[model samples]
Structure formats: structure tokens, C-alpha cells
Target: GSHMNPPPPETSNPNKPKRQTNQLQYLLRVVLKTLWKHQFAWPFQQPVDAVKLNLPDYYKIIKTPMDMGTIKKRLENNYYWNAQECIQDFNTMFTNCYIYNKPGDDIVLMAEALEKLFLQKINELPTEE
Candidate 1:
């Protein structure tokens, strides 16, 4: 049944704010999880083994926490989760680099770039009718 019934194509509706928010959340999670070596084959039925999304450089200081406590502790909360938010955040960062110490701008740029590529790949996927 699951094989035959694919999820519906994404729609554009301004009224669906909750859905839009969730879409970005899921997108960012998927991109970061993939960076963490999660295998994602076509059809997208695989379960994610992700805990938190972090900058790739974060792997140096913290090579990914095995436990939930460290994960919750180390993970950064202030980030742009969606494309619009990401652009706005980048602009804000560009104008106010004095506010940040590390390369948060570069990290976000990489994330946003990867997300665009990921979405392009997903768009190439064949949808069941």
C-alpha cells in the first residue's frame, strides 16, 4: 500500500503556515542528516538517524555526541531554518559581523546551498500518479 500510495506533491498555499514551517524543518533536518552520513535512497522511506544539525566544523570540536544530553547541550539554537529566514539571517549577519565570533555566515551559506541542491534532486524524482 505504501509503495502504491506516494505522498501528494507539494502545493503553494499561503494559508498553510504550519505546513510551510514543517516543510523547512524537515528539509534542513534531512540535509544535515545526510551530511552526517545517513543513507537516503530514492522513494524516501528510510528512517533518519539524526539527533541535531550542526555546522561541519562542529565535527572538529565535537565529533557528534553519542548521547542525547551532550547533543542537547552542544547544539546551537539560533539559526535560519527556512530559505527566506536564511537569506534574511545572512543579510543580518553580513551587516552585523561584529555580533558573531565564529563563521556562522559561511555555515548558513553552505546549508542553504546544499538545501537548494537537495531540493533540485528531489524535484527530479518521479512521483507516482
Candidate 2:
């Protein structure tokens, strides 16, 4: 109705918005899939069992319970908006594990390993953010 062009998408920038979203999305998928299959993922593969483990305070400590299963489903459900949110969840998972389990235990050891693995992959993205 107005002028000539149908609104210009920025031609000056190389970082297209949608492509940036896709980059983070695909990176999440790759890291998630790798973590899913990793041996260290066992403890984090499912939600923690507070009842069985005798730690009812777990819920009180971790307001947001996160697990690999939930992460995968949430990803499929289109829950993550950016890489930071997803990475934050991963950090939350390990933090939760650290809070509940004693250090040097297999679970705690695995948590650090998986956290390190995640950090390595996330570093592939630009550090400008």
C-alpha cells in the first residue's frame, strides 16, 4: 500500500536472526544427543528420586527440577528460546546433583564430567554474548 519494497530484511549484517536461532537449536540438538548417549548421563537421565533416596528436601532445594528426559521432551516441545536457557537447564541439573549427592560419589563425578563436556561444546559459539 505504501511505497515500493515489502520491508527490507537487514542486508548489512551477516548474522540473520532466524539462522542464529537455527544455529543454537542445532547446537542444542547435537550436545543433547551426545549427552543422552554418554555414559556419564546415567544419573541425570531421569528425575531424581527423593522418596527412594530419602531426601524429601530435594524439592525445597531445587525449585525447577530438570533431567535429560525432560530436556529432550522440552526440546521436542519447542520450549527453549535460546542457547542460554538450554545451557542454564543443564547447569541446573548438575547443580541439583551436586546439592543432593556427596562429592566423589559416582553421580557427582559424572555430573562434573557431563558439565565439562557441555562447556566444551558451548564454547564453539561466539563468546561475544
Candidate 3:
């Protein structure tokens, strides 16, 4: 009788890598999409209208000349932090720059600033996704 023994167990490298899913990555996409819709709210496309992520529209909206410098600075300057810092930075920017007491320009400038900062912060991440 031929006894068919199971094949010897295969051993893998101890240093073999493993895949990791990033909740941060997923949330980043969702948040940025909503931000985009908010940015285009003048056309009646508010955050509530965002149903999916649009990376290209996100890129185009963030790449304008007015947005470039601050985005670059924030990405280059800030150390790694969680998403909350990004939100905090936007809050600070709004309070300091956009939310003036006197009547001033419309919402475009501040929205753009907030969007750029959010995008910049997301870009600076070292994620596992």
C-alpha cells in the first residue's frame, strides 16, 4: 500500500511583507471629495452633493496659482500629524484670514485656501495604503 503523505510544509521568509489597508487613506479620499463639492458650492454643488471621489477635479481645483504657494509651504513645513491637525490648520486659517469683522470679499478665497491646505496635508502623509 502506497501511503501518500502530505507534502512537507512550506516555510516563508520571516521578513516577508504583509499588506495593510489604511483607514486614513480611505477617509482622505472621502473628505477631499466632499471638500471639492463644497468649493464649487457657488454652482450649487455643496458637500451634501458629493457622492463619490473625483481625484482629477480635486487636482485641478488645488493647482491654481493662488493655491500653489500655501499648499507647497504647508506640505514642506509641517511635520507628520494625524488628520485632525489638517482640520485644525484650516480652522486657524479661517479665523485669522478669512473671518474678518468688516464686510469683505466673497467666500472663494477662503474656500480655496482651506482646500489647498487639506490637499497639502493629505499629500504629506506616509501611509500604508
Candidate 4:
């Protein structure tokens, strides 16, 4: 048997691992939900500040109202956005956000997926209502 990566020690308790795994999964979901609720926008062309390298707490950046009309109002009011910046923001946030050594790339992919879903949702809606 190849020993490229050695197995964990017998001291590793299997019984409690399930609880820890569940907690980690829940945390990951919470972080993802928070990130999406705060950070994502559709027609994802919103511009970002070129000067700010540090990603802002997206919740503070803009709280999107679920009402379609409010979203349109924000768009009409010259809200800045950029798809590239948005992705970068997500990647940076993911890089900094994760506590465990899980599959790290998933969050960034999720960010893109969330954006696409948002776009689809918006596009499917009527002109108003």
C-alpha cells in the first residue's frame, strides 16, 4: 500500500466526528447564505471601487430587498457593479472566510452560480409586479 498520505491515528474518535461534521456543514451553509444574501447582484455588471483591495462586509454594502421593484429602483439609481469585481470579492471572501480545510473552491463556484440564478430570476420577471 502506498503511503503518500498516512492514515489518521486510532486516537481519532469516530463517534464524535459525525457531530463535528454536521456543525461544519451547517457553518458552511450559513456563511454561503450570508454571502449570497449580501453580496450578489444580477445582470452582474455592477462596478466596484478600484481603490479598495479589501472586500467589504457585503451586508453593509447593500441590502437587497426581495421585492422586484426595489431591485429595479436600485438599478435605475446608478448602482455600480462589475462581474469581475464581484467574483473577486467572492473569492477573496471565501479565502478569508473558511475555518476548516474543506474543499475551498466550492464557495467561489457557488458565488458564480448564485449570480446566474439571480440573473435568471430577474430576467424571468415581468416589467413590473
Over the stretch 1-129, how does candidate 4's per-residue lDDT look in tens digits? Answer: 223222321222334322223223322244223333654433122322222423344334333212222222222332213223223343443333232224545544544555455444434333321
Candidate 1, pairs of clashing residues: none
> Candidate 4: which stretches are off by over 4 Å?
1-47, 54-110, 127-129
Query: In candidate 3, what are the lDDT values of residues 15-105, reduced to their tens digit?
Result: 5432223533433455444554454434212221112432233323332112222322332333224445434544443443343222354
Q: Number of clashes in every candidate structure?
A: 0, 0, 0, 6
CA lDDT of every candidate: 0.33, 0.69, 0.37, 0.33
True-structure RMSD for candidate 3: 19.1
Question: Model 2, 1-129: lDDT tens per residue?
Answer: 222212221123334232236645655567888788888787787777666666677777766777887677656656555767667778888888888778998888998988888888777754434
- Alpha-carbon runs more than 4 Å astray in model 3: 1-23, 39-79, 100-105, 108-129
Task: Give the clash total for candidate 4.
Answer: 6
Task: Predict model 3's lDDT versus the native.
Answer: 0.37
The segments of candidate 1 whose C-alpha lies over 4 angstroms from its true place after superposition are 1-20, 38-78, 87-129
Clash pairs, model 4 backbone: 45-81, 46-81, 46-82, 47-80, 47-81, 47-82
Better of 2 and 3 by lDDT: 2
Candidate 2 TM-score to native? 0.73
- Model 2: how far is 65 from its true place, Å? 1.6
Which regions of candidate 2 deviate over 4 angstroms?
Answer: 1-20, 126-129
Worst 10 residues of 1 by lDDT: 40-49
Better of 1 and 4 by TM-score: 1
State how far residue 2 of model 2 sits from its true place (Å).
61
Q: TM-scores for all candidates? A: 0.23, 0.73, 0.31, 0.22
How many backbone overlaps does candidate 2 show?
Answer: 0
| Candidate order, lDDT descending | 2, 3, 4, 1
